[PDB]
Design a protein around this ligand. Sequence first.
Ligand SMILES: *[C]C1=C([C])[C]=C2C(=[C]1)N([C][C]([O])[C]([O])[C]([O])[C]OP([O])(=O)OP([O])(=O)O[C][C]1O[C](N3[C]=NC4=C3N=[C]N=C4[N])[C]([O])[C]1[O])C1=NC(=O)[N]C(=O)C1=N2C#C[C]N([C])[C][C][C]OC1=[C][C]=C(Cl)[C]=C1Cl
Ligand SMILES: *[C]C1=C([C])[C]=C2C(=[C]1)N([C][C]([O])[C]([O])[C]([O])[C]OP([O])(=O)OP([O])(=O)O[C][C]1O[C](N3[C]=NC4=C3N=[C]N=C4[N])[C]([O])[C]1[O])C1=NC(=O)[N]C(=O)C1=N2C#C[C]N([C])[C][C][C]OC1=[C][C]=C(Cl)[C]=C1Cl
Lengths: 503, 511
Amino acid sequence: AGHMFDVVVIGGGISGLAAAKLLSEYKINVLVLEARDRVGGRTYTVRNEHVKWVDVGGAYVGPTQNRILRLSKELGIETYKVNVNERLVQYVKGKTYPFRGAFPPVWNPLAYLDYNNLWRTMDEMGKEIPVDAPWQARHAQEWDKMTMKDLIDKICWTKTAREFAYLFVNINVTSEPHEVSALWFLWYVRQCGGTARIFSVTNGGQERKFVGGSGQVSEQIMGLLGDKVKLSSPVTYIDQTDDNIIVETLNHEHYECKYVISAIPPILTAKIHFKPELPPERNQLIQRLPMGAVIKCMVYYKEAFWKKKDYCGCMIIEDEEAPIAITLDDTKPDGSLPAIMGFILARKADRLAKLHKDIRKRKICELYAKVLGSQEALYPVHYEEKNWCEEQYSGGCYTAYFPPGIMTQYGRVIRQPVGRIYFAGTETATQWSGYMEGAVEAGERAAREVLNALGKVAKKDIWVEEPESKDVPAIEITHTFLERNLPSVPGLLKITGVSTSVA
Amino acid sequence: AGHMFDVVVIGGGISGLAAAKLLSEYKINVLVLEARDRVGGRTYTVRNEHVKWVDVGGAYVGPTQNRILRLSKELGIETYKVNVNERLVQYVKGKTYPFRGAFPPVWNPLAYLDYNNLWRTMDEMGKEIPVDAPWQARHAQEWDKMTMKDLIDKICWTKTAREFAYLFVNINVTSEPHEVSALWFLWYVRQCGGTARIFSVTNGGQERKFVGGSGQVSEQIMGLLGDKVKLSSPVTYIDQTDDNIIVETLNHEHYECKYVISAIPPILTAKIHFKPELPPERNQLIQRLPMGAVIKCMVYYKEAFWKKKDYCGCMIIEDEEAPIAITLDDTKPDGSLPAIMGFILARKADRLAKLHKDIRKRKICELYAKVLGSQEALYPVHYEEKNWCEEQYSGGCYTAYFPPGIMTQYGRVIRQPVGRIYFAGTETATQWSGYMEGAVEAGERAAREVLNALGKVAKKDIWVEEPESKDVPAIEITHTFLERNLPSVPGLLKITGVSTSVALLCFVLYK
Ligand SMILES: *[C]C1=C([C])[C]=C2C(=[C]1)N([C][C]([O])[C]([O])[C]([O])[C]OP([O])(=O)OP([O])(=O)O[C][C]1O[C](N3[C]=NC4=C3N=[C]N=C4[N])[C]([O])[C]1[O])C1=NC(=O)[N]C(=O)C1=N2C#C[C]N([C])[C][C][C]OC1=[C][C]=C(Cl)[C]=C1Cl
Ligand SMILES: *[C]C1=C([C])[C]=C2C(=[C]1)N([C][C]([O])[C]([O])[C]([O])[C]OP([O])(=O)OP([O])(=O)O[C][C]1O[C](N3[C]=NC4=C3N=[C]N=C4[N])[C]([O])[C]1[O])C1=NC(=O)[N]C(=O)C1=N2C#C[C]N([C])[C][C][C]OC1=[C][C]=C(Cl)[C]=C1Cl
């Protein structure tokens, strides 16, 4: 039944459990309330005979995501490289264009320069931002007033390199470039390791998945806690005016504790009614950090027909109409159950959600067909999907995004405690915020904060550096001499003394 | 005790009660749950001996706000004109500049053109937007991707007319021009009756207040319901999968009903846990409609010293440092308790809130001093303030604002019902959304929707036009011939660029 504990953790997510774990290891009586009838939250592994196991939520891990990898291993969970042996393909206006490498290739000289200048510039601006304190950047104020679009259109002279920029935004933040803050975005990418890493599959965060499903990490870490993790128990009230903190749920349950760690998305923090009304700053901020929109879709075929054309599941579709933006081969390691994973992002997310499951499915197939070639794409065996906009206790999926003007006003708070209530959740991470590893950073960070508050941990050993995973080495990023110096579209015209004319 | 009712209304605000009222008048067993220990919500009249009565929240009403005026009167509440007999003043870079009229005057020719072009253009674009469906406008998609700043900087050539535009945004939406959607804003202003009305005091929505406090409207309409309005009962759960809708609060209470009307701010809708998880669209939208930031501040003096200089309380301060943006004479009708009402908006809101009450107060006085003149401004008798960012069950104050890209994606839902749950709240109004009158539009609209769902009201008589208040006539808006035609800064260059070809082409051929 409902009793008294030392620390009560709201959130059965990775970040939640991570904290719960660490806390138990310090022999602390911690309780963990989860609202869903399951655990893992934004990470969710669906199991049925048609697919065995599938990460319908969080799934990919990579090179610098040491924190998650470590915890993953400790829990006895394996990683498996994502298939990229074949060719990648870019679908632009006309048709499909095979290619190999990080980003697709651009052959128009001007575009090429603009395109390159883009990525390079975004990273240049990024270096100027404090990973742990975006709002502290030099040009911090000027930038946060600018929409990622504004910025993109201010540095892209090629309609090509520009639309591409947009997509990049869609793919990494599940939102439109005009919906988010340039300042924030620049940070998000930087906080992950620059454009290169955040996008690469061969050496990026999309390098590999978990054998058995990323979901397992939460499931596992729950078994180690067992008794101390109440499911279907949505926290709904936190009263911390007394010597003991009160915490009642929606099950009508009641629990008291000495400290609280919130391991749920900032925006969802509002599902809770706080006794001493939270401070303006927080109160105000908790209503400005929206969850992006995405529908993860896996289409299963009886055979990886794309391999027959030296094409790996990966496709980068740039075409208004098309439902999916990017895709990947989600076939199993043992070649079992070939399938293709694709994403429906931002604007498209809501648009396609207006259709019937079947129709949507079709649309997707019809697409994969044209992009690839063989109509073998029109005859799927099974189809699994997940629209995270529906989820009440998640809001959306690739974390929350900061809109224009918010980062530089109420941002300084995300991780700041509100008297005995500490904050976790990947949204408060510093490295890979938004990703699973990001969740861990926080889950633990918050945990240690509370431990320090109990005298068990020094104010120093609260923020701990992670040992580079020897199983997934952090191969440095090769930055070509050309890339480092090739002029920008404007740069080329300033070299060719071209600005004194009427084009 | 917690029983069964026909309709349960979440929200003891004006829009809430309005609905509750209308529903009772149709002999419907309706219940109204309010989270605060009081009623009126964003409208709140503070009472103490030092000020008798003061609207520390919503307060002004005007010419086209017929809905609120009507309900106000019916409840036996009077209105009193806002003082503007004296001179208004604009505080710019240098010092104070007296003036009379709607907007302050701009004397630099170019500025004047740009400045004028501004307002006119905002209204032109507005006319193109469907009051009841912003997202339906022609250039709807192009605009909603553009920040009100983006737009302002794209049509203002004068650093002057531009900074002014910003302020206008701050004052009307309690947010920064770069935080909100140009599309949305343009609508907000249009939905109120264009720039002219939304800002004017002499014939605008700031024409007059309620004698006794706007708060009274809710308080009153509560007495008519009495028993059927539970205070300190924050709704926390809504289960509507059964034949009867379940609704539990935070008091541990439980109520069942046939229909629900949500009369609370969109963003605050999330304080509730819904049984059948709301649809993506709504779910998604409910996390994108933030409440602006403002701190209403009244400073009381023993004498309206500003009247001694032919200055009425009104001041329009344009200067980064200065705490208050705009002010008004908040003295009482009978000259009793002279005082000045000022606002601390957007960025400034949070900044000043970091100070100690006393310090803030000082800063404000020090300002009023310089702006006006006499140091009599440094010796206040009493000071009352309210920072609405603090409020848990309100979020902020001049309603919610739509950020870039949201209106054209999830906007189409604000008023749309989610199975037996209908939506009220001023944020869903069509006329004066954000204002008290706006609240009423909705409160009733939603009410009728539910009545119609009960067969008591036709699908037609659901959206009812309001009879123009004969006590506060809707005087039309005079649009000068000059204003209607004077060229824009670009326009003047386009015209001159041709006066040049004409003068030099005519003369040269001659010699
Ligand atoms: C959704 C999603 C998707 C779809 C995908 C993905 C994701 C997502 N991710 C992310 C993750 O998942 C996250 O971050 C995590 O999970 C987080 O965690 P946390 O922090 O812990 O949180 P959560 O989970 O949310 O949880 C919470 C919890 O709690 C609860 N609650 C609430 N409220 C409440 C509660 N309880 C009580 N009470 C109350 N009130 C809930 O319910 C829960 O449980 C990810 N991540 C990572 O790491 N990875 C991955 O993979 C992922 N995924 C993704 C990504 C993507 N990216 C970005 C992009 C991609 C790209 O791709 C590419 C590239 C290149 C080329 Cl060429 C191609 C392609 Cl395709
Ligand atoms: C805050 C604010 C202020 C400060 C001011 C003002 C305002 C405000 N306003 C607004 C109003 O107030 C509003 O809109 C209303 O009130 C709304 O209503 P409704 O819709 O009903 O809502 P509410 O109230 O919020 O309520 C809700 C309720 O519910 C509850 N809850 C929540 N949640 C929950 C609950 N319960 C249970 N459960 C749950 N969950 C709450 O608590 C509540 O109770 C206004 N309006 C009008 O009409 N008027 C006025 O006056 C106002 N005010 C303002 C305005 C301003 N404007 C815009 C601008 C100004 C300008 O000025 C000038 C001009 C010219 C010259 Cl030369 C100078 C100057 Cl200074």
